[PDB]
Design an enzyme around this catalytic site. Structure first.
Site, PDB file in Angstrom:
ATOM      1  N   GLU A 118       0.841  -1.200   0.000  1.00 22.84           N
ATOM      2  CA  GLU A 118       0.000   0.000   0.000  1.00 22.84           C
ATOM      3  C   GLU A 118       0.887   1.266   0.000  1.00 22.84           C
ATOM      4  O   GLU A 118       1.787   1.389   0.846  1.00 22.84           O
ATOM      5  CB  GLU A 118      -0.898   0.024   1.254  1.00 22.84           C
ATOM      6  CG  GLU A 118      -1.757   1.276   1.370  1.00 22.84           C
ATOM      7  CD  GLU A 118      -2.535   1.558   0.064  1.00 22.84           C
ATOM      8  OE1 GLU A 118      -3.328   0.707  -0.362  1.00 22.84           O
ATOM      9  OE2 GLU A 118      -2.325   2.610  -0.538  1.00 22.84           O
TER      10      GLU A 118
ATOM     11  N   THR B 283      -5.901   2.029  -5.096  1.00 24.43           N
ATOM     12  CA  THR B 283      -5.695   0.547  -5.056  1.00 24.43           C
ATOM     13  C   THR B 283      -6.481  -0.233  -6.137  1.00 24.43           C
ATOM     14  O   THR B 283      -5.948  -1.128  -6.767  1.00 24.43           O
ATOM     15  CB  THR B 283      -6.070  -0.083  -3.675  1.00 24.43           C
ATOM     16  OG1 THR B 283      -5.374   0.609  -2.670  1.00 24.43           O
ATOM     17  CG2 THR B 283      -5.661  -1.623  -3.580  1.00 24.43           C
TER      18      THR B 283
ATOM     19  N   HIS C 284      -1.083   3.545   4.837  1.00 18.66           N
ATOM     20  CA  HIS C 284      -2.158   4.255   4.129  1.00 18.66           C
ATOM     21  C   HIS C 284      -2.341   5.598   4.821  1.00 18.66           C
ATOM     22  O   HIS C 284      -2.295   5.662   6.049  1.00 18.66           O
ATOM     23  CB  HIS C 284      -3.468   3.459   4.199  1.00 18.66           C
ATOM     24  CG  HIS C 284      -4.562   3.999   3.328  1.00 18.66           C
ATOM     25  ND1 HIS C 284      -5.240   5.168   3.612  1.00 18.66           N
ATOM     26  CD2 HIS C 284      -5.127   3.505   2.197  1.00 18.66           C
ATOM     27  CE1 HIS C 284      -6.145   5.396   2.673  1.00 18.66           C
ATOM     28  NE2 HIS C 284      -6.098   4.401   1.801  1.00 18.66           N
TER      29      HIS C 284
ATOM     30  N   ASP D 157       1.427  -0.028  -4.980  1.00 13.23           N
ATOM     31  CA  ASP D 157       0.250   0.168  -5.844  1.00 13.23           C
ATOM     32  C   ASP D 157       0.207   1.515  -6.533  1.00 13.23           C
ATOM     33  O   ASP D 157      -0.205   1.600  -7.702  1.00 13.23           O
ATOM     34  CB  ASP D 157      -1.101  -0.164  -5.169  1.00 13.23           C
ATOM     35  CG  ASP D 157      -1.377   0.650  -3.919  1.00 13.23           C
ATOM     36  OD1 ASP D 157      -0.525   1.367  -3.361  1.00 13.23           O
ATOM     37  OD2 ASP D 157      -2.514   0.565  -3.454  1.00 13.23           O
ATOM     38  N   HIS D 158       0.649   2.547  -5.817  1.00 11.67           N
ATOM     39  CA  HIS D 158       0.656   3.928  -6.327  1.00 11.67           C
ATOM     40  C   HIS D 158       1.396   4.788  -5.296  1.00 11.67           C
ATOM     41  O   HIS D 158       1.759   4.315  -4.220  1.00 11.67           O
ATOM     42  CB  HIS D 158      -0.789   4.446  -6.536  1.00 11.67           C
ATOM     43  CG  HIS D 158      -1.649   4.292  -5.315  1.00 11.67           C
ATOM     44  ND1 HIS D 158      -1.518   5.102  -4.204  1.00 11.67           N
ATOM     45  CD2 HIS D 158      -2.595   3.373  -5.002  1.00 11.67           C
ATOM     46  CE1 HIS D 158      -2.360   4.701  -3.262  1.00 11.67           C
ATOM     47  NE2 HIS D 158      -3.015   3.646  -3.716  1.00 11.67           N
TER      48      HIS D 158
HETATM   49  O1  LIG Z   1      -7.576   2.702  -2.673  1.00 12.09           O
HETATM   50  P1  LIG Z   1      -6.821   3.052  -1.423  1.00 12.09           P
HETATM   51  O2  LIG Z   1      -7.466   4.106  -0.596  1.00 12.09           O
HETATM   52  O3  LIG Z   1      -5.294   3.246  -1.496  1.00 12.09           O
HETATM   53  O4  LIG Z   1      -6.857   1.664  -0.626  1.00 12.09           O
HETATM   54  C1  LIG Z   1      -7.896   1.280   0.296  1.00 12.09           C
HETATM   55  C2  LIG Z   1      -8.242  -0.014   0.300  1.00 12.09           C
HETATM   56  O5  LIG Z   1      -7.515  -0.902  -0.391  1.00 12.09           O
HETATM   57  C3  LIG Z   1      -9.028  -0.383   1.320  1.00 12.09           C
HETATM   58  O6  LIG Z   1      -9.777  -1.457   1.217  1.00 12.09           O
HETATM   59 MN   LIG Z   2      -3.714   1.985  -2.311  1.00 14.55          MN
END
Ligand SMILES: O=P([O-])([O-])OC[C@@H](O)CO
Ligand SMILES: [Mn+2]
Length: 424
Positions: free
Chosen positions: A38, A83, A199, A258-259
């Protein structure tokens, strides 16, 4: 409308590459484990804060000496789906939407996804594990269209107060329980673990932290240091558990951010942290999110190929020994000599080996200095970028897979998938 599909199919033909004979089919029917980091940016790799390595385990993997091939020039291509965008592209080799979330808005489109292909061709059972509830980002609906067999969501984990921070489950308990769930699965499987702790706003209980905050004064940046360290520790321990369970050596293992976690809103503090002004060119460079892959029987290393998340699906399929000529995909196999070294960004920016194109200007990657004399291949590359984004959007907006009689794909029946509530 079948014409619209035809135009996109024809468009994606020219980039098709032949597999590298050294990698072709080498992972046929081996388990594949995919680990999502994440908000992870590779500026963390080798970074120290107050003399402590923020990410010591990933630093080892990124040396190329630990059985993983690391790509330092690997970029996410996400937009507002965050995500879910990354997930979408990783499993389809299609772009997310220019605005909003493909998961939320195109959840009952027809797809010819990676997990479904692996199931059909080679008997893979697929799963996703995640410490949030299943209808977040519409995953419950979407995954049935992808042909994912199992979804271990928050209802498979103890969500008591001591086990949660921020959005839900702490990564260390997540990985520990997830390794135990994987040990009970039948081979061949394709397992995707989606983490949560690193996050925004990057808050970590003091009792969990093992590194102190940076001191930029920006709570986001300073907090990111601690959650990134925590994720690095969770991951080290997860890999240990795989080795104990016999799930390490003969598994394909991929790891990826992911980003970006730190936006341009934090440019002041990022300038302090990294000791360099965060120009648009520099921020583009910081969009490196990393890819690490361990393939059984193959040594690790460092591969400097410029690439994106679109390239992951065709890479996996060629590792499995699957012919991909009939799959509608925008990326190309990372290990093929013909890999297309152009990486479109969702906003129309893009990067290549030599230069980047950012808000309508070209910069040399060497020094991020402005270029005034157009590179030879710039108009060709810019056109590819624009047409890639538009053609991919045409697939999503026209739901074009509805019109595809693919000799190498049986249409998914989404009603055949159900994700039951877990015991917790
Ligand atoms: O898209 P985000 O906010 O990075 O990720 C959040 C989620 O994966 C939560 O289920
Ligand atoms: Mn994410």
């Amino acid at each position: 409308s079948e014409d619209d599909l035809t135009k996109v199919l024809n468009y994606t033909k020219q980039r098709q590459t032949e597999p590298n004979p050294e990698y072709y089919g080498v992972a046929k029917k081996k388990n594949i484990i995919k680990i999502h980091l994440e908000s992870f940016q590779t500026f963390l790799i080798n970074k120290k804060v107050n003399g402590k390595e923020v990410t010591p385990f990933l630093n080892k993997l990124s040396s190329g000496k630990e059985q993983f091939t690391y790509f330092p020039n690997f970029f996410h291509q996400t937009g507002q789906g965050k995500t879910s965008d990354s997930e979408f592209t990783m499993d389809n080799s299609l772009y997310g939407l220019p605005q909003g979330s493909a998961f939320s808005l195109k959840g009952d489109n027809t797809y010819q996804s990676l997990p479904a292909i692996l199931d059909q061709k080679q008997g893979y059972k697929s799963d996703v594990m995640h410490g949030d509830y299943k209808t977040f980002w519409n995953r419950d609906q979407v995954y049935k269209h992808f042909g994912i067999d199992k979804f271990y969501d928050a209802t498979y984990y103890d969500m008591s107060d001591k086990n949660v921070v921020n959005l839900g489950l702490k990564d260390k308990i997540f990985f520990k329980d997830s390794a135990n769930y994987q040990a009970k699965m039948k081979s061949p499987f394709y397992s995707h673990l989606i983490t949560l702790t690193n996050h925004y706003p990057f808050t970590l209980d003091e009792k969990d932290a093992t590194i102190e905050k940076s001191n930029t004064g920006d709570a986001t940046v300073d907090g990111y240091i601690q959650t990134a360290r925590y994720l690095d520790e969770a991951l080290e321990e997860y890999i240990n558990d795989l080795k104990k369970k016999g799930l390490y050596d003969n598994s394909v293992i991929m790891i990826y951010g992911d980003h970006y976690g730190i936006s341009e809103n934090h440019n002041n503090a990022m300038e302090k942290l990294l000791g360099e002004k965060i120009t648009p060119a520099k921020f583009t460079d910081l969009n490196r999110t990393g890819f690490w892959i361990k393939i059984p029987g193959k040594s690790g290393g460092i591969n400097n190929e410029y690439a994106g998340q679109v390239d992951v699906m065709p890479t996996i399929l060629h590792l499995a020994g699957i012919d991909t000529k009939n799959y509608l995909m925008f990326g190309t196999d990372l290990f093929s000599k013909g890999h297309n070294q152009v990486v479109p960004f969702r906003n129309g920016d893009f990067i290549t080996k030599d230069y980047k194109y950012v808000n309508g200007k070209i910069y040399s990657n060497k020094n991020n200095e402005l270029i005034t004399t157009q590179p030879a291949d710039f108009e060709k590359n810019k056109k590819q970028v624009e047409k890639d984004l538009e053609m991919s959007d045409n697939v999503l907006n026209g739901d074009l897979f509805r019109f595809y009689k693919n000799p190498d794909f049986k249409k998914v029946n989404p009603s055949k998938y159900k994700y039951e509530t877990g015991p917790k």
